[PDB]
Design a protein around this ligand. Structure first.
Ligand SMILES: C[C@H]1O[C@@H](n2cnc3c(N)ncnc32)[C@H](O)[C@@H]1O
Ligand code: SF4
Lengths: 901, 444
């Protein structure tokens, strides 16, 4: 349920230095370009085809430039196939169609040209068709033009050599006959696509690092020649243009596995008269990019469903390469302009205030914008909830503050969508398209569209981008249909992110330098801060300082804008403080900061202060209030504070809405100081917190307003749950430590040691006088419902638990009021409840002690005793005189002095 | 306490795919067309369940009654028993034999003496030694609309399908008799009928190598087609008179060494999501019978020890219960999409000690499926099991309080329906539910 966005796009034309040093170069066509992992630079080659001339130039990311080699070749008209740079043995290599392995060597300290050697290091008889290096840069896999595949080493000495042999699938009428080579992510395997006739058929063969045939493919029809390999271990990801008439007449993307079998498909929603020229996997996984003639679109997949999260536009694509080390950055070449573009994730969502909460997530699936408000319907990532269709290919989305207005941009058009109300949204209405505001009224043809935002559902901010600079546009969407323009504010840098702040009352952005500025509804730029490094995801709000007793120690209240972001490698910053150093996701809330740690935890930071210090390190026994364990990489998606609930998403693709302890307590403590006691009690039972928060947080407000607690808790089966399950220690100082008014750099208080055998007796070494917490409130419960005549009618059963839960164990007063119950059989229904929470012979000896023998009979029948023992003993006690009985009854029990009286 | 597991075997018969294929499965041992004397299919006759069956001569009233009272001569003090059927292809038997079989399964608990299937389950509802479910294993081509509602009349709640492979070539070359795209379609009609679907998987089959085993099981939980509620891991054993014994004879099939196999199942359990359980890691075959394959009978603990020094904890719902006191518990839920519907998994957890208290399953009834008459007149939602271990008592009524509030609001349903077994039909009648056919439902 996560999208893709464009961070930066910077184009430039690599021109080749003429010997006369002027303008008007003849052609100098751009051939190829690679990356450099050891220099943070880009190595590109230039050349000509009429004259056998070449050029190579290194571009460091500071404006500098070097020229590494410039010589001339024989065999004039040809083309280049592969080019790689080792950058440790400072050697350049070349592979041509004419079978040349021309190499070059430079020196790292004197960057002048023409001090380079040129050897040949091998010549292939009768041409080379394809060539490719390995990811370990150890092995070539070039295919000769005479239908023969060879394998070399780094020192260019041959390893082995294999000549090949030759319902059945057809070949479509759109393909050309070239050869493509693709490696396994961990090498020792590669694959070679080729054409045979037996009818003409395109297939491929899988080889080892040595020249050994392993497997061949299935004959599927119309293999368009595009070939690749998922570097995780499977999924060759071919095309299979389907030329069958009917409904099944689309163009797909089909997958394979290394034994040559068929496994998996998905549909690419394209017209049929369009040429697919390339397909590329990124460095690790989770991003597939197919290359058209003038257009590049990226495909991702989660639960076996593919998405079209992003799409790039250009004029003429020739080659597309991903980055080896870092992911989500790639380059291409459009009419001679090498342009770097880099990507990141984003979760376009709504507000987080406790009103207008309705936590709404907005994802992109090609030509549609899928919606899921997780406070109304908890829809898993495969299905969605009341989507809406568009005449476009949505690149980025944003919603308003009432989240009834939906914006989604395309190429050369900007499209609004609206909802009448949030409760009639729930009845079944999809969002209706309202107006299609084109890209001709607020800018020229030369600008592009990247991002969009809102502010208090009245102005729409739109991130434009020029080739040199970048500016944002403000709009007026009161009277949503027929919108009008507000002035085109401009800033003299290149914007990376654009986002509305928390409360949606301003907009914030970020340049390449890390400078975060703030923009109001009429275009007044206000700088906030500058991060130490480039952050790829940040949030902005205005925190407030609040002391303990809410206007205490009151002098000169203040506030300060704080920015909360995580950079690429995982440093969480907050105005250059470096909170943590392995964070991978975040989402802010009112009164809380939330982030995951990649040590498989989910920890909280309060937002009532303004000082920020680095965090205490978490260790394996933390148990404070602010750490909960996470499985193997579940990240944030949204926070719903009005339900006190946090939604996550795991790696395999499910959802998981944990209910964290820090916010469930944060609402029950709000209700018991608001004197509610019923909305507080229900949350105490469904989440299974220790049930005596109602006393152990306001210990003097409870007893003072206890008659309200009995009237509001109107049920008998809950009051018997309150009194029975009471501890003897204080839960506020042991488990629920209320870490709010407690600072930031306070160490996480570990769990107590296990109370072993000598500590058990030294816990109850001090028994319980008339000062314990149990006997205080159990008396106080009896203080009210032993006064009115009607309170001991309905709540007569909880009186039995109120006595029998004490440390003096006042069973003699519980068994006294049972004997006065004369109306019905409720002596049976009460003694069967008193003998459950106490041993029965303990009740039997106590019922025997208050000198009424008919009560002791009913207790003994519940006692699994032999009826020949007690019943004869009860018969001798019945017929005597009363004073004769009170001596006989005390010899049995041990009350010898009381017997003697 | 707990649940008593009484295993019975039906009459020794022939699978029904021997006719049009020419023979049974390549790896299957035993059966009538074998050398084991009087043994059910996929058994050898030397198993402790398969030795009680031969002495009973497969009489269902006498096989079950001797097993039940044996377990209370040891002194388990049984009052809740869950039957499981095994051996053969029970739903391939004739119709007048299958219904009379299930009737005498119920009469061994109630004491009623009769032959009507519609009346024996009514006497069995007010039984005191009660049945909480019947597990019946079958093939994926025997879960049509004619067979799924016969199991509802029998009292069946959980059913098991042998999948054993997710590739198309393996189900063809082992003469399995169906396709893998057919079993992912019959999972959808089974889960929308309300069954706990458990599948069987078999590593080390022929022509599936070492690396293909780990992308087989990674797909099984990432793909929303399968994502079932249980597994039984059954590694391939070479037996004497089987079909793959000749492949072992001529040297065209060799098995795994017992250091790479325990490394494999230490990685398979690492990917197990917290809503499914692993019933078995191997099956009860006495090792003198087996020629190649698994050496010992302790692969469960050797797999848990091998992932101790990898840092990875198996988060399995069979492992993560009380079997250590909670002292506290939280309420979490999980939401995944499985083969046409929105599954949810409510549970009570401790994230520190990694222990479970109770669980529950619930499903939105889809629209492409759900042929049942009771689930068509209005939009309904199906609760599929409730399972509470062991105050520590009110965990049942909390999971039913929350699954009903989430059905009216978030599902938008007018009726909730339970697939409770026959002996536990009275636990739901106190909570306001009413019986309508096989289900124990209520208008919302
Ligand atoms: C009836 C059940 O027995 C299992 N089964 C069948 N043959 C074998 C074997 N050789 N090894 C292990 N399990 C087997 C099937 O996978 C099915 O689930
Ligand atoms: S596997 Fe299942 S089906 Fe195939 S033979 Fe053995 S038992 Fe019969």
């Amino acid at each position: 349920m996560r999208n893709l966005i464009t961070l930066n796009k910077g184009k430039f034309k690599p021109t080749a230095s003429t010997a006369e040093g002027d303008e008007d170069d003849l052609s100098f066509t751009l051939l190829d370009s690679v990356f450099d992992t050891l220099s943070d630079s880009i190595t590109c080659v230039l050349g000509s085809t009429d004259i056998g001339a070449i050029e190579v130039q290194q571009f460091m990311k500071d404006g500098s430039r070097n020229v590494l080699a410039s010589f001339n070749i024989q065999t004039f008209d040809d083309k280049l196939l592969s080019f790689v740079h080792f950058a440790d043995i400072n050697q350049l290599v070349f592979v041509f169609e004419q079978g040349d392995i021309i190499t070059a060597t430079y020196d790292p300290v004197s960057l002048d040209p023409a001090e380079t050697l040129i050897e040949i290091m091998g010549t292939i008889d009768n041409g080379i068709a394809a060539a490719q290096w390995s990811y370990d840069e150890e092995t070539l896999a070039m295919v000769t033009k005479d239908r023969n595949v060879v394998v070399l080493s780094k020192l260019f000495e041959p390893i082995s050599e294999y000549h090949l042999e030759v319902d059945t699938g057809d070949v479509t009428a759109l393909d050309s006959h070239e050869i493509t080579i693709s490696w396994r992510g961990d090498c020792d395997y590669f694959a070679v696509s080729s054409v045979e006739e037996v009818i003409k058929r395109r297939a491929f063969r899988v080889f080892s690092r040595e020249g050994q045939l392993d497997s061949a493919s299935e004959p599927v029809t119309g293999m368009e020649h595009q070939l690749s390999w998922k570097p995780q271990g499977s999924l060759i990801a071919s095309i299979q243009r389907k030329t069958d008439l009917g409904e099944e007449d689309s163009v797909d993307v089909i997958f394979f596995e290394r034994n040559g079998l068929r496994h998996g498909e998905f549909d690419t929603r394209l017209p049929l008269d369009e040429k697919v020229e390339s397909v590329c996997w990124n460095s690790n996984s989770e991003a597939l990019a197919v290359v058209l003639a003038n257009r590049i679109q990226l495909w991702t997949s989660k639960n076996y469903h593919w998405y079209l999260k992003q799409e790039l536009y250009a004029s003429d694509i020739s080659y597309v390469k991903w980055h080896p080390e870092k992911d989500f950055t790639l380059m291409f070449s459009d009419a001679g302009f090498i342009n770097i573009v880099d990507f990141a994730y984003k979760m376009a969502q709504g507000p987080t205030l406790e009103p207008f909460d309705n936590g709404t997530s907005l994802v992109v699936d090609g030509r549609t914008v899928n919606i899921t408000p997780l406070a109304l319907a908890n829809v898993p990532p495969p299905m969605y909830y009341r989507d809406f269709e568009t005449p476009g290919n949505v690149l980025d989305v944003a919603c308003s503050f009432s989240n009834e207005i939906y914006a989604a941009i395309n190429k050369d058009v900007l499209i609004f969508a609206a909802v009448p109300s949030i409760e009639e949204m729930k009845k079944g209405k999809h969002p209706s398209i309202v107006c299609e505001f084109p890209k001709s009224e607020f800018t020229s043809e030369v600008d592009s569209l990247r991002q969009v935002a809102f502010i208090n559902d009245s102005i729409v901010g739109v991130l434009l981008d020029t080739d040199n600079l970048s500016r944002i546009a403000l709009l007026d969407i009161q009277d949503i249909t027929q919108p009008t323009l507000i002035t085109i504010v401009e800033v003299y840098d290149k914007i990376v992110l654009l986002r509305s702040d928390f409360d949606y009352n301003h907009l914030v952005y970020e340049t390449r330098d890390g400078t975060v500025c703030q923009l109001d509804a009429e275009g007044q730029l206000m700088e906030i801060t500058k991060f130490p490094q480039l952050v790829r995801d940040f949030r902005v709000k205005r925190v407030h300082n609040t002391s303990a007793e809410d206007d205490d120690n009151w002098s000169a209240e203040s506030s300060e804008l704080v920015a909360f972001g995580i950079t690429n490698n995982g440093k969480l910053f907050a105005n250059q403080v470096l909170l943590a150093s392995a964070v991978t996701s975040l989402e802010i809330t009112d009164s809380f900061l939330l982030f995951t740690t990649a040590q498989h935890n989910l920890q909280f930071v309060h937002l009532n202060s303004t000082d920020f210090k680095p965090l205490p390190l978490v260790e394996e026994g933390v148990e404070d209030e602010r750490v909960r364990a996470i499985e193997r990489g579940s990240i944030l998606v949204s926070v719903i504070p009005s339900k006190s609930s946090v939604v996550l998403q795991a790696t395999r693709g499910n959802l998981e809405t944990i209910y964290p302890r820090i916010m469930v307590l944060a609402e029950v403590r709000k209700n018991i100081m608001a004197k509610r006691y019923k909305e507080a009690f229900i949350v105490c039972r469904t989440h299974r917190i220790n049930l005596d928060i109602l006393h152990d947080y306001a210990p003097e407000l409870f007893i003072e307003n206890l008659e309200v607690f009995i009237n509001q808790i109107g049920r008998v089966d809950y009051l018997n749950l309150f009194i029975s399950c009471l501890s003897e220690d204080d839960v506020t100082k042991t488990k629920y430590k209320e870490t709010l008014y407690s600072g930031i750099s306070k160490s996480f208080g570990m769990e107590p040691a296990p109370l072993t055998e000598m500590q058990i007796y030294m816990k109850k070494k001090m028994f319980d006088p008339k000062t314990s917490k149990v006997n205080k409130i159990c008396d106080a419960v009896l203080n009210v419902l032993l006064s009115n005549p009607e309170y001991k009618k309905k709540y007569l059963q909880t009186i039995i638990t109120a006595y029998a839960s004490q440390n003096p164990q006042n069973l003699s007063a519980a068994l006294k009021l049972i004997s006065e119950l004369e109306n019905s059989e409720e002596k049976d229904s009460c003694v069967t409840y008193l003998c459950f929470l106490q041993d029965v012979n303990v009740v039997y000896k106590s019922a025997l002690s208050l000198y009424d023998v008919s009560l002791a009979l009913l207790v003994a029948q519940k006692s699994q005793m032999d009826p020949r023992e007690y019943l004869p003993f009860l018969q001798e006690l019945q017929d005597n005189e009363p004073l004769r009985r009170k001596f006989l009854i005390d010899d049995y029990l041990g009350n010898y002095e009381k017997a003697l009286e | 306490s707990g649940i008593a597991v009484v295993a019975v075997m039906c009459k020794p018969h022939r699978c029904p795919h021997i006719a049009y294929t020419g023979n049974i499965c390549v790896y299957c041992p035993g059966g009538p067309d074998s050398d084991f004397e009087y043994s059910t299919q996929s058994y050898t006759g030397y198993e402790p369940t398969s030795m009680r069956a031969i002495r009973a001569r497969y009489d269902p009233y006498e096989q079950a009654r001797g097993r039940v009272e044996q377990l209370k001569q040891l002194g388990h003090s049984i009052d809740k028993v869950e039957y499981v059927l095994m051996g053969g292809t029970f739903m391939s038997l004739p119709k007048e034999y299958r219904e009379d079989f299930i009737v005498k399964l119920h009469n061994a608990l109630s004491g009623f003496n009769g032959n009507d299937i519609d009346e024996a389950i009514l006497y069995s509802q007010q039984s005191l030694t009660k049945c909480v479910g019947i597990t019946i294993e079958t093939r994926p081509d025997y879960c049509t609309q004619t067979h799924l509602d016969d199991m509802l009349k029998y009292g069946c709640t959980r059913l098991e399908i042998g999948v054993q492979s997710l590739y198309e070539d393996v189900a063809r070359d082992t003469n399995r008799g169906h396709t893998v795209r057919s079993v992912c379609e019959t999972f959808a009609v089974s889960k929308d009928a309300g069954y706990k679907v458990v599948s069987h998987m078999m590593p080390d089959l022929p022509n599936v190598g070492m690396e293909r085993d780990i992308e087989q099981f990674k797909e099984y939980f990432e793909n929303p087609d399968f994502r079932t509620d249980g597994l039984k891991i059954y590694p391939t054993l070479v037996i004497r008179g089987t079909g793959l014994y000749e492949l072992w004879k001529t040297g065209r099939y060799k098995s795994y060494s017992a250091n790479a196999l325990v490394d494999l199942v230490a990685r398979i359990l690492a990917l197990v999501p917290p809503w499914t359980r692993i019933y078995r890691v191997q099956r009860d075959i006495p090792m003198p019978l087996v020629t190649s394959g698994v050496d010992n009978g302790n692969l469960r603990e050797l797999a848990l020890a091998r992932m101790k020094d990898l840092g990875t904890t198996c988060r399995d719902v069979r492992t993560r219960e009380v079997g250590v006191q909670p002292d506290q518990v939280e309420l979490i839920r999980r939401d995944y999409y499985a083969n046409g519907g929105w599954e949810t998994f409510l549970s009570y957890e401790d994230p520190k000690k990694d222990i479970l208290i109770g669980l529950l399953r619930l499903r939105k009834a889809s629209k492409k499926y759900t042929y049942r008459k009771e689930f068509t007149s209005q939009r309904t939602s199906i609760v599929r099991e409730l399972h509470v271990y062991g105050q520590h008592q009110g965990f049942g009524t909390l999971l039913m309080e929350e699954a009903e509030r989430i059905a009216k609001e978030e599902h938008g349903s007018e009726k909730i329906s339970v697939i409770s077994g026959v002996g536990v039909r009275n636990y739901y009648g106190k909570l306001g539910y009413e019986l309508d056919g096989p289900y124990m439902s209520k208008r919302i």
